[PDB]
Each structure stands twice: as C-alpha cells, then as structure tokens.
A paper describes a structure:
In human mitochondria, [name] [name] ([name]) and the nucleotide exchange factor ([name]) work synergistically to stabilize proteins, assemble protein complexes, and facilitate protein import. In bacteria, mitochondria, and chloroplasts, the GrpE-family of NEFs interacts with substrate-bound [name] to facilitate ADP and protein substrate release. Herein, we present structures of full-length human [name] in a nucleotide-free and substrate-bound state in complex with full-length [name]. To stabilize the complex for structural analysis, we introduced a point mutation, [name], into [name] (mortalinR126W) that is associated with EVEN-PLUS syndrome and has been shown to reduce [name]’s ATPase activity and conformational flexibility.
We term these structures mortalinR126W-GrpEL1Y173A and mortalinR126W-GrpEL1Y173A−lid. Overall, these structures closely resemble our mortalinR126W-GrpEL1WT structure and are similarly nucleotide-free. Considering density for the [name]α subdomain is also absent in the mortalinR126W-GrpEL1Y173A−lid structure, we hypothesize that this complex harbors a disordered [name]α subdomain and may represent a post-substrate release state.
Author numbering:
A (entry chain C): 59 to 217
B (entry chain B): 59 to 219
C (entry chain A): 46 to 437, 441 to 559
Amino acid sequence: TLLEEKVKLEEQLKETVEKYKRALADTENLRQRSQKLVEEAKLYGIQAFCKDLLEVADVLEKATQCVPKEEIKDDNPHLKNLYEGLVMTEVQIQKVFTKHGLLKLNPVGAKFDPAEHEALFHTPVEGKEPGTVALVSKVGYKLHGRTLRPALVGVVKEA
Amino acid sequence: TLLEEKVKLEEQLKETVEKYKRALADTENLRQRSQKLVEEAKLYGIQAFCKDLLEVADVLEKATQCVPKEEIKDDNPHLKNLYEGLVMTEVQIQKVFTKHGLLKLNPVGAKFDPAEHEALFHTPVEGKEPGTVALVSKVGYKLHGRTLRPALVGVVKEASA
Amino acid sequence: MASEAIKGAVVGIDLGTTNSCVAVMEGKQAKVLENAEGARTTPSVVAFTADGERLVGMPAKRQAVTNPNNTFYATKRLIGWRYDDPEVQKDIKNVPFKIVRASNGDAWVEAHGKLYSPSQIGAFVLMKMKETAENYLGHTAKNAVITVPAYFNDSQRQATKDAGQISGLNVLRVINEPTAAALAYGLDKSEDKVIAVYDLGGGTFDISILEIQKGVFEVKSTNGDTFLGGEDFDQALLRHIVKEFKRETGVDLTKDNMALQRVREAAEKAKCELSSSVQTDINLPYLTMDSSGPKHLNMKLTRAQFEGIVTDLIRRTIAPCQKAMQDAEVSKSDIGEVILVGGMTRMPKVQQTVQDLFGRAPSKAVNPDEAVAIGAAIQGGVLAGDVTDVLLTPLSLGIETLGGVFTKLINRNTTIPTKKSQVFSTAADGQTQVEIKVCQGEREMAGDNKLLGQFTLIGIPPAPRGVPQIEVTFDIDANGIVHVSAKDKGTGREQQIVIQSSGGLSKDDIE
C-alpha cells in the first residue's frame, strides 16, 4: 500500500521529468529549424532580387563604354559632365553590389575555371599561355561565394 | 518525515505536470511564430538592398532630368547614344523595382498621412484644401506596405487671414 | 511566499532618451525585436493631433514640422523633475512645446488643453514597444524590465515604475543601465572585480565605475558629459565635407536641403566605414544644379583626417573618466575590465583613448548599440521565468540507401533518450535481402564519413519494387547506449547491431 505508493510516485516523477525534458528538447530543435528556414528564405529573396538586378548594371556599363575617350573634351560640356556622372553612378552601383555580397567577376589574365567562367570561344594567342583568359566579353557576378551568373569569357587555344 | 516528503513529492509532480503543459503550449507558439517569421522573410528580406539602391535610382532619374533636351541632335551623335543608354537603364531599373513590390510614393495632390510621408515644410498654398500635400520634393518608396523611404512632401497650411 | 507562477514572458525594454529598444530571450540568447517598419529602434517621440491621436515613433518624427507645438521629444530629461528646478528652467526655453507647472510641483507637458505628466509620455512609448513585442511573441506580455540611468534617484525610479505600470505592464524590476550593460557583456558570473562602463555615442556621455563583489553589482561613481554625443561627430564630418566642397567648386550646400540630406547620409556611411577600413571615398553624383551645369562631389577621406577632425570631442571624454576614477577611490590598476557601450565606441581612436585611460584593452564582445536592451532581457529572463533550465553535438548518425545517399534518420542536436521511426521501400523488384549500413557523420555520403557496422535483414515476401515497406526504428536509451533495429511486416526475421561506441578517433578527420 504505502510502500508501493513511494515506488509509483518515483516512477511517475521519472516519467514526467523525462517527458518534460523531451518536450523542452523539441523546442530547441524546432527553433533551430525555424532559424534555418528563415535564413534560407532570406537568401532566396536576395538571389531573386540580384538575378534581375544584374541587367541594369550590364546595360549601364555598355552604354558608358560605348563612347570612346577621344572626344570627351571641354568644348562639349554636355557630354563630359554626363559621362563623368554616369561613371560615378557605375562606381556607386558596384559599391552597393559588393557591400551586400554581390561580387563582380573580371578575370583578366587569370586561369580558366569552368565553375566561375564560361568559354565563349577558343582562339590561340601569341605570348599568352593556353587556358588563360585573354579577353572578357561579359562580366559575371558571384553572390556569397557562389556563381550567380558565369562570365562569358574567351580561352586561349593551342597553336 | 516520510508523509511530508511524499506530500512534497506529489506537489512537485503537479508542478512538473503544469510545466510540461506549459512546454507543449510554448512549442505550439513557436510553431506558429516560426510560420509567421518565414512568411515575412519570404515577402521582405530585400529591405536593405532596396534601401541602398533607392539612391542609384534617384541619381539616374536626375541624370534623365538634367540634360537640357536641346543638344541631343546629329551635331552631337555620341551624346545622343549616351542619353538613350541612360534612359534605357532607368526604365529597366524601374521595371525591376516594380516586379519586387517597390511602389514609388508620388502623392501629387493626395492627403497627408504621417505613416508614409515626411513633411519638409508647412507652406500655405491658396486654392488648395488644407491637409493636402502641395508638392513632392522627392518620391518616396515602399514595398508590400512597408515604407522604405518616405516621400518628402510640403504640407499646405490654413491661411492666417 | 510561494512561487509567483509567472507563466509569462519578460521583455527587457531599454527606455532611451532618444531611441528605445525591446529585447526578448529566445532560447539561450537575447533577441532584439523589430517594430512595424522593420527598424530595430523606436524613437521616443509622442505627438498628438488636433482632434485626437497618439502617433509614437517614426510616424511622430515625420509629422513634426506640421505639428511643432504638440510633439514631445526627449522627455526623459523631465522625468521625476520638479518644475522649479534648474534643469527644467534651462530646458523650458529650448523646447517648442509648453512645459507647465503641476499641482504637486512636477514639471509636466501640455497638449491641446490636456495635462500630461512626463511619466505618461514614457508610458505611451512603453505601450508602443509592448505592441511591437506582442506582435513578435503572439501572446500578450505582462511583466517587463525597464532600464534607467545610474544617476537616477529613487523618485525617478518610482516614476519609471509608474510609467511602466500605466502601460498595462507590471514592471518586474527597474535595472541600471551600467548593470544591464555588464549583464549583456557577461560579467554577472564573475568574481569580485572593479569595472568601468564607457557610454559614448548616444545623445549624452556617461561613465560609471561598478563593483562585482558577491555576484551583485554596486555602483561606485558616475560621471559624464551633458552636451557631448554621437551627433557631434556626424556634424563635424558634415561641416568638413561642406567646407571642402565649397572650397573645391564654390557652392555651399548649407542653403540647400536635399543636397544636405544626401551629404549627411553619405557622411554617416563613410563614418561607419572608417572603422574597419583605412581609406574611404564619398561619391554623390548630381549633388547640386548650377548655371554652368551639374556639380559632382568626390572626396577621398582617410582615417587620419577623420581622427583629426573629431580629436577635440574624444579629448573631451578624458576629464570625466579621471574624475570618476578619483571619486571611486581606485587607481588605474584596480579596474579589471572595461565595458564599451554606445555607437561611437567603435572607432579605433576611442578604443585607444579608453585603453590609455584605464590601462586595459576594452571588451568588444557584444555589439555596443544594443547592449543595454540585451542585458535587460537577460536579467528579466533569469530573474523570473523558466529559462535557466534550458541554460544547462559534433557528429550525427545515418544509414545507407540503395542510391548511396546518407539519409539523416536522426538529428544531430538531439537528446540521447529519443526514439524515432522511419519506413523505407525495397531496392528492386524481386529482392529478397535488405541490407542496412550504420555510419556516423555530417556529410551527405555514408562512406565519406565513417564505417561502423552492417546488418542485413533476411526474408521478405516477393513483391514489385516500391510495395514492400520496412520500418526502421531507433531505440537509443539511457546515456550512450545505442539500439539500431529494423522492423518489417513481411516476415518475422530481423537483425541486430551493436554500434555502442562510435567516433573514437576524434581528430581533424572531419576538418
């Protein structure tokens, strides 16, 4: 009777404390899963933003690089000022991109990398080692160490 | 002492049962709050990026508005191409903004409301209803109902008379 | 007196003089909650419209120009202060709104013929943070911990307690700002020591010398500069940039407003940049319009120039520290730790000055912007609430699949007495033998992590692939005893495996 009461109380206490510990352990694992899910959602949103954002920088860079530096003179005050403003806006755009992890890709004279570079064409070049970039057609971008868009680049072939 | 020890043990059992129920309620609350946080981070999460690029968009708009619209001729063939490139870039950036919920606040003649508009001056304007926004110094932005940058307006003031 | 049966969440509200903050103890670390507009800070401004409204926060700063005689900003300077006091007498001239005399001789504020005490303004701001905390929590919060500056009297502490109580919030305990900073920096679980708290960056500067004897913090001396803060650094940089631009071209942006705003924001960005980078540049295209055309600003700013601009301000943080050391009756060798709080305690010149003044390298293990709120949340969680129970895994376990994928049957951070079950199908059609391989690791490849054991389940009825179901149940029990078994409903023939000791070669193999 009373002797069995102590045994049953000890068993009930052990079961209740173990169930409490398991309930508390579920909260921590659920919290970690929630943090992972929130971070993954943030990453997906930022990636979706950057993928559409790259085209603005590409178009602006093409527009500014269209004009050569020979005719940018003080006798054309409406063109030198605009060119300077556009170059500074490009610098600002690149600064904001690299501030939020969006890294540019300008591998001039670097070793060819299939993951980070796209081989537009193969052409031997004198004085340059094969498999090394000789020119860059389009500048790619990298986000947090992953290639968001490979750079369309040329690879020196063997002559 | 055995009787009071067993009474204390039973009280501890009741307390730990109540605490177990509290833990179950807490994990249910965590489930609901996690769902809400995941949804919010799905919607937003481009807040810092957009709040940084607002100035690039403003600069591009100012560049489109600053060329005197008279020297874009065949006498200046290279200036015309640069202006066309700038216009295309501005249009593309405004197209990218609109896709991701960015809606420029341009209350030209709407009613002032502090939740979205930042007042810059209280100049009275004759012929305009009091409480409306006379002009928009800078077009603010907002995404999904969250005002990233307020539109810097000038609110009209009732006449002193 | 028995247990209080809190059954609620305690939030630590940092009721600041300009910018407030609310933080809660999510699990093992204090988490700062963000308000509706996504910011981590609610400005302490309360304004009332003509008919009736309670705009608090940014919607109260934004409309300040149209409502200049009703917006109450930085009312923490009038809490618990009698009307006939030197501080209120000096303050009344500057504030646009009318500070009036109350019946009980208290400095109150006025709005559209309705009397508000300085406690009620803080009560409204506390209501705002209560809403922004209930939004995150989901359920209402009743008990809270609110922090006050270390120089507050007992009357001001009572006033802040009343302000907390008015906003449907049973204030748990009123804490000191230096004590909350020490709690956030983690000096609560430390032996007897003497520390100093460097609070620079807000609207005011404050230095307080503490003491951690017997695990309880006792304030020894407090001092600081009334008219010094983090706004002066930004103003100095802004004025330098404006003067440099005017010298370079000839247009002053002081008469401008949009250009001034852009320059101010760029100055803030560069100042925050001139703490981990030696050199910075400021680009602001199309800053101003002139008859000659647009003008662009392009300044190259180095760390040395910035240090030389604000050297006087940092020099001004030297006499109060020495006076606080003198009044605390401890020399530069007694101080065993230095606590850095505030936004302006990040630039290396400030840290060098602090080290020179105290002789110790300052502790920068916690973001100084939100240390007070984090400490308040930690103290509120520890004092009342079942959080200390949760206060008290480099590898995981998996199985082998037909495709070789290292399926994660059990999680990594899981308690030992946990039982989980999973069902799996057969490999191919006509298969009669099912083999399960046990391994430990975190990479998604069974053979690339470890190789512990292998047991084969023999005997299943013939069936097309995908129809047979085999249930894998893990019965790890006690502590360190692992039970791995597979159950199938076809034939009553299972297999066992030991896997009692794993990961014996704990070395850089994972790395």
